[PDB]
Design a protein around this ligand. Sequence first.
Ligand SMILES: [Cu+2]
Ligand SMILES: [Cu+2]
Lengths: 620, 620
Amino acid sequence: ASPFRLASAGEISEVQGILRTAGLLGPEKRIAYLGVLDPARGAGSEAEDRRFRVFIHDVSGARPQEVTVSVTNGTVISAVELDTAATGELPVLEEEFEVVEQLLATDERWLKALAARNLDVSKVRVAPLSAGVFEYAEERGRRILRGLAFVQDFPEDSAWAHPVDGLVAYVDVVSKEVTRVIDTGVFPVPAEHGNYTDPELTGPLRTTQKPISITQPEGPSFTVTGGNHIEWEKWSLDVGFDVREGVVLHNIAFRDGDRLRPIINRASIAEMVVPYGDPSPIRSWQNYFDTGEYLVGQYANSLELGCDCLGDITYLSPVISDAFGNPREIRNGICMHEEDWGILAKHSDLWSGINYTRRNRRMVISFFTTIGNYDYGFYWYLYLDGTIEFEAKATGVVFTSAFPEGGSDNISQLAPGLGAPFHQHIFSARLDMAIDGFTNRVEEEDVVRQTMGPGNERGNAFSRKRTVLTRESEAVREADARTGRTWIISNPESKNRLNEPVGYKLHAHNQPTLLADPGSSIARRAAFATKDLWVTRYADDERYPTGDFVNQHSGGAGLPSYIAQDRDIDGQDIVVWHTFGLTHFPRVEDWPIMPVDTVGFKLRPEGFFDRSPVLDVPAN
Amino acid sequence: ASPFRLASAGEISEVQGILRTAGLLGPEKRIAYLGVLDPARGAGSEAEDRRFRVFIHDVSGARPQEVTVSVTNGTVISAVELDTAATGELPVLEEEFEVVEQLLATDERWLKALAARNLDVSKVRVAPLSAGVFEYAEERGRRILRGLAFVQDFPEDSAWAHPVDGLVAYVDVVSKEVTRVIDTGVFPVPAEHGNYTDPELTGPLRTTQKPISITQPEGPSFTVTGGNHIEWEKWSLDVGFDVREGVVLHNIAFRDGDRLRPIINRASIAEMVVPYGDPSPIRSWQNYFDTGEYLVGQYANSLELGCDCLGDITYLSPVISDAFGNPREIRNGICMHEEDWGILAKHSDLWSGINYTRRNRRMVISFFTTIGNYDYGFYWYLYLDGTIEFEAKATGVVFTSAFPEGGSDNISQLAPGLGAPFHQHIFSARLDMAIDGFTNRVEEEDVVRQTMGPGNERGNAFSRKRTVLTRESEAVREADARTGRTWIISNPESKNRLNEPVGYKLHAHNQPTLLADPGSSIARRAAFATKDLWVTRYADDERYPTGDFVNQHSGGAGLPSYIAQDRDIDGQDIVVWHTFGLTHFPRVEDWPIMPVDTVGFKLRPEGFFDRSPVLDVPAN
Ligand SMILES: [Cu+2]
Ligand SMILES: [Cu+2]
């Protein structure tokens, strides 16, 4: 019954039928993106209109289309031809991954480059990398991927240990032509393998690790009804899944006594950018938007019990569409479990003689995705005390290059002759706020140091100041760790028993934002990543900080375009976009496969409750 | 056999015998501090000299003494009379806690102040607060505590809910005189109780939490030999305990193949300061050094299985001396266990077809201490991948005041009429570094942004720079979160297989440091807390960032005194002191007992290993 249920196999089939019947899905067509649309503001219209948005690629070269279907009434609502030279190409198709390698295996420039290196073309793998927008005027309106090559000594060899430097090719995947091959020169191919399952590398495995058994003999404290509605320790929410964004949290709310109080209307990681800081022309174009360009949801892993998720695990298996409109199930694609989280509260009082201790717990919702050499885990946590936290776990295999003779300022050496360019992984959290409802405002809170003098005779005083962000034109904010800067999202029309607005505080990690020059191409296309915090007025079509079609878009779409409307945000339906990420200078310990590193953010209540919300937690 | 074993009951008894026999411990004497001394640099002298340092208070008013004993040869090594007016008073004695309240219960100014408020003196509790050094010239050389009063309606009432504002008294605890009583005016006493076990406040307890069972059916993967020597997953260390510092880690080292490689010689939280930012003369003097002034080790909790520590717990029960030299055991004062820590490393490769997943684990060493209204957990974690992390968990009951009518800039309101002054909790980690041995150096590493131009034509390049700290006079460093500033501790004479110095990277949280005016008294006494990172040359007597006698010392001792020697630190036996802490603007949710908040730091290897050190972790 819930308009927020996961798409089913049946719904995607019905979308396939509707598109076919309408003549929109013939044999030369491909679904580049399919996803359910959220209900509009005001679901008072009884019975839901389950609508779906679709991007349809045309392999014969005709113009792509954006189509919206209503599977409830079984009709096409709208269909728009897209001009990709203006508004960006469609997301990369999975079936275009291999096209880059097979085209190059019969191009004479590529074979010439490999012959110069004594490389067997049947051992050379080519990574299908997104192209971006640079100084190649001929790439306008064309669907282009770029190729970087890695040698694979045998079918189970880790190709990342053998980068083929000085060589890159550009490929038109629709007309199937190799547009350019660039050969800046010969670099030795690093010969050491990086096979982390080879006993020569690993040595004998440890026998010292004894098991840890985490069980819940009575089962878990949460309940799933309606496929994806979660109730856990006063928390209530719906777990969605989008092939582009991955796991989406809807209707996050908290049962405060008898009233169900909204906190967040919709939470997602709406974009991901990985810019590389190597100035070598072989890689200076290299940036990936894994979310916008590749869609991280469609690369979700199946997570195995006792390996990926440990404990009493409840699984969800989301359904997505393949390139032809057939439903594809991602088995065990989402993990949900609760886990112990140490001491929640503790005091032993000298005067009353009472000793008090309570344990904390958190609810975990996670999925893991793989894009080429990179693996990323997305973790949402809910805590007993009302804290909401997001954590990204970055692992996998670092992207490699040759290590130049005589060193580099932008590459680190992991192995003889083997380099790993410097880069960042930068995320955009989109938080459609609904703190006790939709009348919200954002305040910037700074620590205030005070001077020794009258009224502060001992020089011990300090304070704070809050600055209300009133219009979008003033709501592009920078971190300031030195003054403890945080941001408070409050509802000015909902007060707690002390007559103050209820609120939640956003705690950032204050990592560096985008390091690229502000005149570069990537600063233009990843403009959200240049600032820590943006606030916009809610609007149905403003969904991604980079716009709808990120692939090969020239820049400026998304957030800097939304912000320019200078709308009123002081007590309105607002959206918070938080940029955060990792700056990765690769270390020897990241090789041949890298241990997890993390980054994220959290929100804690700030006078949302009338007292501590965990006074009713038992002792156990 | 280990010189690093915990002091036993027998050793403390023998110290009591030695002091008595030497005439140093008659009936008017009190042990204010007793602790084992670490071995000197160069333990090549066979058979250890177990030595103990003692501070002896004299209740009759004679000068205190610092005494060092050798329990191996059963002799006093040295005994120094202390001039406390010059070098600071001894740590607060536990038996002086109640003296402040009992003296005031018969002083006529105090009874007059209570009668004006209609308060029954038998219901008024008085907190024994350290005095600091301010503008009261008569306090020089005297042992003084300050008193703030809280009303307790019944023996099990939480007194913190009823602060008696506008009233403070100073008390000479040796001569047992009340030196001053100050009454700035009458504030209503907040009447709402804060009894978090009263069913009226809590409501009915939740019944929705089902159990989580964490067991190790084969027992734990670590082993304890010799009382306190830990071996776990290639880590090796000794767990010490000092009545002042609490848990101390010694000889942290890592088994890299067949060689045991040192990382840290000694790790401790060497000081703790809690400054208050309320300018009201009733509290503008209020700062506590819980470590230096009260000794947090002697207030360690006994931790209960399944409440404080959950899982297969191994306990240590350290032994300390009471005020008369009798051994006192802190039963279950230290918890040690391993716990699951999610994914360690993960990759699914498209080209080789290999899917790889490994779990992370961490070793936990923790104790919990209670000082008055505050409770703090100290957690040391060791990870499979060589990461070392420290985490402080702050909880307990906030320190309260009246909330003035018409508001405050330095106090937040938690309940009608109930205020909680702004304050910080600031820690000093002392890390006696030994990265592959004792020849170490510290580099400051900043991100370097690069300008669009020749050699960087696309404006994507970025880099880093490392600045070697060579003399102590240049080794007082500030955080800079904006440029990703970190610090690397390396051994310039120990290289990895890539011929680079082996190293460890210190990752700070970049929270604000001390906010008080730089001319204030607390900026003088807590000078370490004004900067993020200090590096000194090792010396046996430079142990605390505040000096040996913090109680009522006028300032400047410790780190600014050590730094002035301007010693050479480029490739030497060095010590790293990291300041970090929380700035606490209390929230309604912190009342009536506050959920844990955390802060800390971590160190990760930086080219210490020749590749990932967890290639040999099995699948399980
Ligand atoms: Cu990376
Ligand atoms: Cu606090």
